[PDB]
Design a protein around this ligand. Sequence first.
Ligand code: A3P
Ligand code: A3P
Ligand code: A3P
Ligand code: K
Ligand code: K
Ligand code: K
Lengths: 6, 6, 6, 6, 490, 490, 490
Amino acid sequence: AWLFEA
Amino acid sequence: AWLFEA
Amino acid sequence: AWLFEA
Amino acid sequence: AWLFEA
Amino acid sequence: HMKEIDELTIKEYGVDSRILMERAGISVVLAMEEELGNLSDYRFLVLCGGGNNGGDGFVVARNLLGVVKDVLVVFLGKKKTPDCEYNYGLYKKFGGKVVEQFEPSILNEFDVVVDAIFGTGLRGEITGEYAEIINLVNKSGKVVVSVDVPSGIDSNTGKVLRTAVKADLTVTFGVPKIGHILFPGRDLTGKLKVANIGHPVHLINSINRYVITREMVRSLLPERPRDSHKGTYGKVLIIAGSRLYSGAPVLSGMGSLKVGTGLVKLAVPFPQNLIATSRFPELISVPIDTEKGFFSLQNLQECLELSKDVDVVAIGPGLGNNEHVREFVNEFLKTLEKPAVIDADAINVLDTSVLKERKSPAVLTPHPGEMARLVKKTVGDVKYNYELAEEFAKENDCVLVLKSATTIVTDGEKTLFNITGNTGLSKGGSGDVLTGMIAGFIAQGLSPLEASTVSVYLHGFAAELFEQDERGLTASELLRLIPEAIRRLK
Amino acid sequence: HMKEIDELTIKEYGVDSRILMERAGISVVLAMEEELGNLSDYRFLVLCGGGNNGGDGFVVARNLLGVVKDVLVVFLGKKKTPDCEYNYGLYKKFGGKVVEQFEPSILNEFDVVVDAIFGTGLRGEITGEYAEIINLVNKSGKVVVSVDVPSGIDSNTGKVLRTAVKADLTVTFGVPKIGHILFPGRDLTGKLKVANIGHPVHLINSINRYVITREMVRSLLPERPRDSHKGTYGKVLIIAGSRLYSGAPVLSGMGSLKVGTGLVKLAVPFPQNLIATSRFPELISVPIDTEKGFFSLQNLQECLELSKDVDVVAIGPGLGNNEHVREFVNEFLKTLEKPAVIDADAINVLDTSVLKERKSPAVLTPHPGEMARLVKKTVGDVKYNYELAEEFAKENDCVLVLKSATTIVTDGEKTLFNITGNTGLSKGGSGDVLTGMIAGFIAQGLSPLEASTVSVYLHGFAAELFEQDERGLTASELLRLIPEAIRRLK
Amino acid sequence: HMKEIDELTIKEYGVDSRILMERAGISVVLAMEEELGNLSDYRFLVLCGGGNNGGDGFVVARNLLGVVKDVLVVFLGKKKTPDCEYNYGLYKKFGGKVVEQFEPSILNEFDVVVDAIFGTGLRGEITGEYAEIINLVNKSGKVVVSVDVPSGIDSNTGKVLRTAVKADLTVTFGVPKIGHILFPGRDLTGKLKVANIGHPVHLINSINRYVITREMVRSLLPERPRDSHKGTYGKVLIIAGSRLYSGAPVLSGMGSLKVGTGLVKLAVPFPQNLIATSRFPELISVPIDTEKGFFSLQNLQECLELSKDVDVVAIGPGLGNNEHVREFVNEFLKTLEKPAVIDADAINVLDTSVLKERKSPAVLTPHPGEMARLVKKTVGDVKYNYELAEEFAKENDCVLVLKSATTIVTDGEKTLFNITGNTGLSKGGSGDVLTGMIAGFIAQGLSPLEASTVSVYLHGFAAELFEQDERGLTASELLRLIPEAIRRLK
Ligand SMILES: Nc1ncnc2c1ncn2[C@@H]1O[C@H](COP(=O)(O)O)[C@@H](OP(=O)(O)O)[C@H]1O
Ligand SMILES: Nc1ncnc2c1ncn2[C@@H]1O[C@H](COP(=O)(O)O)[C@@H](OP(=O)(O)O)[C@H]1O
Ligand SMILES: Nc1ncnc2c1ncn2[C@@H]1O[C@H](COP(=O)(O)O)[C@@H](OP(=O)(O)O)[C@H]1O
Ligand SMILES: [K+]
Ligand SMILES: [K+]
Ligand SMILES: [K+]
């Protein structure tokens, strides 16, 4: 989860 | 499928 | 086996 | 593989 | 006709008739192998007539020589057409055995009977020794493979011509024939394989009568755009029910909702209207005040007002059939300028002049008893009578959906045959569901013909998905199975 | 605005604009890899405009150099912003190819199109060559990845600006934009990934319009203390139904019970009240004696008495809409000192002055047709118009739940967007269930806004859990799926 | 020759040449479908010469019309034989596209290349534009299906005629051709399918050169009667080894034991004989006292005494090759009245006059270097030269087993080709094992020819059952795998 919310 | 429809 | 030997 | 070689 | 398609393929495309015949026969050999597994352990009895069907049989027999345990041809004709003669000649040069007398005990020595006695276009009742042989093959318990059509089926109608071969497997060429599709022929066909024997694909496609397939229904199913609302998916009014028949409305209504319709309204005599919402509260069930429990001309104006705000009207299931219902039904349809789906008691009281006069479209959904009464013929004259149905549809500007184990759907130009379903649909309530389905699909944007095609298929397919014995299927269970049929179609 | 958040992050926090742009572009590369797998076998066509969206594209193209099969940039702008220019410069120093003419056949040689033509804040209709290029990309069948927002979507509204890219994957920065959330933009976005590109988490959090997420709904769901009794979980009165619409009450009532409400009472005209308990005998369905099958002022005092012993009142589903219903609804709500959930026909007859005067809270749950009639505008003026909804909510002191494929929930200060659901909810009965859910959650102790947020989410999520094709979903099935949605949320 | 078999099938059996050609082409279509799955997504480029191979190609192309995504025929010949012309004519009547110029970029637009340029009996080196086209197809990376034989292989020898198509799939008719079986042709053939196209099974069977199959080896394997004892399964003497080559005897001996031989005795120079029993104590390893570590005439009488009580003698592996070995070997074989298996250094010193004089049988097992030296020709003149091997076998009254990736086994009348094995057999020790196997099977009662046929097959099949990379296979591991090969054969 650090880079992307999906 | 080339020869037969089933 | 009628058509092809493999 | 774009970011990391492992 | 395939007869015509063979002729054009030979005479205009220039394919040697012998090449078509060779391809036909090897396709039978391949089909039998697919069904039986390795052929080498089996003994084959091949029954050849004098015509080209027999010619196809000689090709089968010849191609089994040296590969299987035993092959014998019993030649039953009196003379041979040129291609039959050529292939008889090859079978003999290849070392094959032919006898010309059928001995009842010969069945004892064989495992598979290849029925190449008669093909398509046979017209006469089979009697004499042909009959005896066919009856012996039917009592024999052997595996029966029929070349083209089981011998004794009329390939244009599906009727038995006094007696006919009952096949485990039928291998036909180019396209299914009407006699494979309609009963009794459909039953005698057993498992049907349709072989490509080299006709140009353009001629195969030119046929104007089709079997409804999964792929055809999948490409007709409407789109469900994500940004939509109930009006996107249409509105149906269903005019149905009476004090005698309170269940019909409920089954039709849910049939529209289960296929994706946005809004469904019923008009049903009070208090029978209350039955529908106690079972499915998502329905709107409008109370219609009647004098004696049946619709009459006094309800005309209310029903036409209700009609204005819908896309399609289904009428008929459980209305009853008396004179006041007759007046109401005919006056309503004569004035309604919306597509109409007309079923059951609305068919029974229908004045067919009214259909000719309507500017809006219609679908009629009779079973053969209802069809018989409508055109004033016997059930036997109308059942599976696709030409009568086509003429009726063309003359009255409608789509006719003639229900039976094979259902016929036609607008007079295009005719489609439905083969999905089982005997659990032979029970009250089944038709009421289909009427709802058809109305629903019209409301969602399909044409009357498209709506009918998709509906008959899915209605039959839903029945097949019932988990338990089909004879225990009921309409309520069928409704539950519709959305699974839809998912499986995709 | 993210535009503002970028500015503050650069100007006040001191993050170099180039660092934000680098992070944006590498985040696109990582997202594509997650979606496509190993990138090394693919050929990429990157379409760059002149602005910072194009700049992000140059970063993507540059980071693919030497790693993938082929990369080409088609530069479509006329001039480049400073960060776009810098990154164009790097792409070229790194050995990258740029052309400035779009050749229709160039699509033939690539597997993936990276759409970095226009970003957020585009305001004008796209015409000329930009349009042609966008239309060619849409017809091409290639995999399309859009940087920030699909080019041609207005990122503040979700509208198509004459034409717009249809993306398989959209990678946006910081937060989803309104144009990803509302249709048509939501549809053109395809799969959306939201990348962290280094904005301070405090600015990301300051956004006042949010997408409703699983985690937000899970933390709002009320507690169920073991030592409780039905009154712990509240009591709802639902005033609903009429002789025309007998099903509505049943669906609203069960909607309250399925979300955990302790007691649900319906007030429905006799004998239609009897429909609800024949279907769900756990409901209390009070018979209201009416003159003609509709609520009127003669029922005011009975309804206010029934109201005293509940926590919340839902009113509207299936009431009908005539003058006596209008008088009753407005006089009732003007006197009721309980929270009210106002739906359907109660919206259609609502005098909005009455809402301003109420001391107690309200939730209104219109679809856009109902909203349009309520504020006297067109459906097109109100649909997805979150600013109008906010103003209405603020001016009338209520929570407004504007239903559509993306539902908007606002009290005028906070606005939330719901994206759960599918087209099976586009069918009669769906709204009646939601009205019950909202009332139920208010009865259990959530605020009107919280109750609405949790309800729209769970109502949509329940629809998604239907096992068969969504178009066959009905309200009764949706009710059955609510407790599974709840369990899955936890 | 199949060329002859086609002629007899047409001229004496009366099968129309066009019927054979149709069957050939549809068999290619069926084979491609088996390999590729559904053909409808593929675009086919069919390269037709002017001869009947091209005719077969036109049949393929015509049968794909309307069924697949795209079909194009590039016609490369100058004139067409009558059957090619007829089928060109049908392809065009059916709506097919033919061009007569090959454009290098045309490969870009197709997924599958059907190589129907040249067939069997091509004799000349391919140059000019045919070569260019073949080289382009080979560089193209597309899926290549060759009709009959890859164009450019000499179907009688397996040699490349300057250049040749490298096929993924080859579909041949009736029987495999020598050019599919011998290298390089075997390599260029890719996966080979042999189609039945309707030749009488009697003519197919009349071919005097065969591929050794599992079924043939299974029916030759000797019986193991339960009531037996070691003498039931024969006794082998192996005369082998020297002070230089101490391992050979051990590998030959175990090779006899692993195929079921009852008793194996080695005669090996002391003390090298002791090597064999330290590794496999089930061997009898007789110490032979020699002057300098090599067999000589002084050991003749001991070896003939040892011979009396065995069924077969293998001689040669690791004997060394000097004059005293030469004298011993020739005097021994001239006097031994037992079957002899002659390998390696016994071949290198063999006087072939001695073979003509022997009344007892022999099997010789040279690799091509050994064969070349034996008949005083070059390796290139003898390698894959089945006619030379047949003449040698016939002239010298022996079975010749000419080892290579495809091994040839012949007694001068019958010739069999072995295709089992892999490159792990290309390593010292492999041959020594095979020599033991052959001797063992002769000892168990098979004829020299039968023993050789079963042994070459099982030796190759054992290699294929190695669990790890074949290049790591060693003779000791191969021995371990023999009884698994045997079990799998049954
Ligand atoms: N398990 C329980 N624990 C505490 N109080 C209960 C209870 N069950 C019922 N009651 C009480 O009984 C009344 C009706 O219960 P409920 O609201 O659960 O139907 C309420 O009283 P009051 O009349 O004092 O408000 C409530 O206090
Ligand atoms: N999600 C939505 N999007 C657009 N229009 C909607 C809508 N929901 C309702 N409507 C509008 O509300 C009315 C009734 O909706 P439905 O037909 O879906 O029940 C229709 O208006 P009109 O009266 O302008 O035809 C339709 O335009
Ligand atoms: N199980 C068995 N059945 C029959 N004969 C056996 C036997 N085992 C050993 N023999 C006999 O013993 C001798 C040596 O046995 P083997 O060849 O099996 O080693 C042979 O005899 P002869 O000397 O009479 O030929 C053979 O007849
Ligand atoms: K028949
Ligand atoms: K973009
Ligand atoms: K070829």
